[PDB]
Design a protein around this nucleic acid. Structure first.
Ligand SMILES: [Zn+2]
Ligand SMILES: [Zn+2]
Length: 431
RNA sequence: UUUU
C-alpha cells in the first residue's frame, strides 16, 4: 500500500493521487491544473489510465475532476465513485469547462463517457476492491464533499481531499478523520487562520446597509459553485434588516447550480435542512433575479442603484463581473466586496492595492468605489482548523498548497511531533 | 478555483 501523488504537489491544482494496494490501482480524484499549469493538462498523466481499477471523487470542483474526461479519452472504462451530490454538480462543472476551454483537451464524447461511469457512494458506505476497504468521510467543503478512508493490508490511509471552514453555516462540519498510518492532507491556508465568520458577516451587512441606502451598487465577484449561493444564504437570513433592492445573480452557471440545490438538501447543515423542512428555500432571498443573457447583463452597468450583484469568475479571470467593475468601479457610491481568495499577480490583488485607476478590458477606469476583502468567507479550512483535524495523526504528507504555506504548516506539524513531508510528483509514499 |  502506497500513494503516488500525481498532481497538487507544491501546488493546488491538478489534484490526483494513485493508490496502489491489494494488487489494485485506485485513483483518488482526477482534477485539472489551472492558470499557469494549464498546459500540463495536455501533458501525460504519468500513469496508465487503462491500468486503473476504480476511481473515487472527493468533490465536484474542477481542480479535482477537470481531468476525468481525459482519463476516459485515454482508455479508462472502470467505475468512478462519488456522492449523488458530487455527481450532479459534476455534470454542470464539466459542461462549463468544455465551453470555457481554449485548448479543449477533451470533448463532449469524453464528458458523456466519463459521466456514464459514475456510481453513487454515500458516507459510511463501504466499497470493496481486492482486500481493500474504502469509505467516504464528511469533509464539508462542498455539497457532498468527502475525504477518503482507505484501509487494507493491515494499514490505514486517509486522503483529506479538501476540507471546509467549519466556522460557516451552509455545509455541515467536516468530520475528524480516523486514526491512520498515513494522512495525505491539503494545506491551502497552511500559513494562516481566517477572520472569524461572525464578524465577516456583520461587516458584510454593514457594507450592505451603507451602500444600498445611499442608492449605490454592491459588486460581489463569485464562484458559481458553493460560494455564489452561500452569499445568497446570508441575504436570505438577513434580508429583514436589509434595505430593499434587486439581487442580481448575473451568472447562468450559478443559476444551474442554484436550481440544483433543492434536490441536495440532505447534503447541507442541520440549520439549512431545518429551513427546508419549514417548506422554504433559504438560498433565494427576496428580490433575487437570475440574469440569463448578455443584453440584460449589460443593461445593469447603465442602470442606477441600489442593487447587489453577484457574478463570476470569482477571480476576475473574465466573466460578466469584469463588465460590471469596468462601469461601477469609478463611482464612489458603489462598493466592491471580495468574498474569496484573489491570486497574487491578478487584477484582484491589483485593485486591492488600491491604485488611482486600474485597467479593465482595454481602458483605464478610475477607482472611486470602496473596496473590501472578506476573507472570512473562505471555503477552505484555515490553518487553525488544519492543525485540529491533523492533530493526532503520526505521519502526514502535504498536498494542495504553495510550498511556502505547506512548509509553514509542516514546521508546526514537526515541532508538534508529527512526521511530515511535502509530496513530490509521482513519488509514492509508504503507507 | 472556471465564467455569455
Ligand atoms: Zn475544492
Ligand atoms: Zn481543491
Amino acid at each position: 500500500m502506497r500513494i503516488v501523488p500525481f498532481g497538487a504537489a507544491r501546488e493546488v491544482t491538478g489534484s490526483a493521487h494513485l493508490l496502489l494496494a491489494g494488487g489494485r490501482r485506485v485513483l483518488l480524484d482526477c482534477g485539472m491544473f489551472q492558470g499557469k499549469e494549464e498546459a500540463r493538462n495536455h501533458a501525460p498523466f504519468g500513469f496508465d489510465p487503462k491500468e486503473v481499477d476504480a476511481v473515487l471523487l472527493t468533490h465536484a470542483h474542477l481542480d479535482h475532476v477537470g481531468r476525468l474526461p481525459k482519463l476516459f479519452r485515454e482508455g479508462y472504462r472502470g467505475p468512478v465513485y462519488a456522492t449523488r451530490a458530487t455527481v450532479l454538480l459534476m455534470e454542470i462543472v464539466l459542461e462549463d469547462a468544455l465551453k470555457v476551454m481554449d485548448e479543449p483537451f477533451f470533448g463532449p464524447e469524453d464528458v458523456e463517457e466519463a459521466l456514464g461511469h459514475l456510481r453513487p457512494l454515500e458516507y459510511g458506505e463501504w466499497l470493496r476492491l481486492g482486500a481493500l476497504s474504502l469509505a467516504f468521510g464528511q469533509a464539508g467543503h462542498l455539497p457532498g464533499s468527502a475525504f477518503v478512508v482507505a484501509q487494507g493490508e493491515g494499514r490505514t490511509l486517509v486522503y483529506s481531499g479538501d476540507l471546509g471552514n467549519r466556522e460557516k453555516d451552509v455545509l455541515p462540519d467536516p468530520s475528524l478523520p480516523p486514526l491512520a498510518d498515513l494522512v495525505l492532507a491539503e494545506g491551502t491556508y497552511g500559513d494562516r487562520p481566517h477572520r472569524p465568520y461572525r464578524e465577516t458577516v456583520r461587516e458584510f451587512l454593514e457594507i450592505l446597509e451603507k451602500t444600498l441606502s445611499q442608492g449605490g451598487k454592491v459588486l460581489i465577484p463569485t464562484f458559481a459553485v458553493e460560494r455564489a449561493q452561500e452569499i445568497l444564504y446570508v441575504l436570505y437570513t438577513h434580508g429583514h434588516r436589509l434595505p430593499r433592492a434587486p439581487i442580481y445573480l448575473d451568472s447562468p452557471m450559478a443559476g444551474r447550480v442554484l436550481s440544483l440545490y433543492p434536490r441536495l438538501v440532505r447534503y447541507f447543515s442541520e440549520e439549512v435542512q431545518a429551513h427546508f423542512l419549514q417548506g422554504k428555500n433559504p438560498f433565494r432571498p427576496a428580490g433575487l433575479e437570475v440574469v440569463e443573457h448578455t443584453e440584460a447583463s449589460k443593461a445593469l452597468n447603465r442602470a442606477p442603484g441600489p442593487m447587489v450583484v453577484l457574478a463570476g469568475s470569482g477571480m476576475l479571470a473574465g466573466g460578466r463581473i469584469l463588465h460590471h467593475l469596468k462601469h461601477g468601479l469609478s463611482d464612489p457610491r458603489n462598493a466592491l466586496v471580495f468574498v474569496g481568495y484573489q491570486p497574487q499577480g491578478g487584477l484582484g490583488a491589483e485593485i486591492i492595492a488600491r491604485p488611482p485607476a486600474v485597467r479593465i478590458l482595454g481602458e483605464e477606469v478610475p477607482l472611486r468605489a470602496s473596496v473590501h476583502t472578506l476573507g472570512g468567507f473562505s471555503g477552505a479550512a484555515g490553518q487553525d482548523e488544519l492543525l485540529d483535524w491533523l492533530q493526532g495523526e503520526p505521519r502526514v504528507v502535504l498536498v494542495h498548497g504553495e510550498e511556502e504555506k505547506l512548509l509553514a504548516l509542516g514546521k508546526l506539524l514537526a515541532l508538534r511531533g508529527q512526521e511530515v513531508s511535502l509530496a513530490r510528483f509521482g513519488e509514492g509514499v509508504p503507507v
